[PDB]
Nucleic acid binder design. Structure first.
Length: 71
DNA sequence: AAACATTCGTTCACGTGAGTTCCAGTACAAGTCTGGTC
């Protein structure tokens, strides 16, 4: 239904769960279409440019600029 | 009366179960890099 209404996803919560600051995966869960395999459309695009990287990956092209073709 | 077969307590090797140490696989959390717009 969320996919029908063009929404991000759904959340599932446990009724007997207390509040715990800064804690993940205790009583709250999320489901998005991306997390389910096959439910998304993927794009095949070309790499037309590159950028240099920051500290952990310095002397290599870390991010890229992609382009689609013209019929 | 003498020779041969059987039996018995002993011995060794080999196999299997339980305890201990070490390492690989798994899980989770935090850190680091990136993307997009307003």
């Amino acid at each position: 239904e969320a996919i029908d209404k063009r929404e991000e996803g759904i959340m599932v919560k446990q009724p007997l769960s207390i509040y715990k600051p800064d804690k993940r995966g205790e009583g709250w869960l999320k489901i998005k279409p991306e997390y389910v395999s096959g439910l998304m459309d993927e794009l095949d695009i070309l790499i037309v440019g590159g950028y240099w990287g920051k500290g952990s990956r310095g002397g290599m092209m870390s991010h890229f600029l992609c382009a689609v073709a013209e019929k």
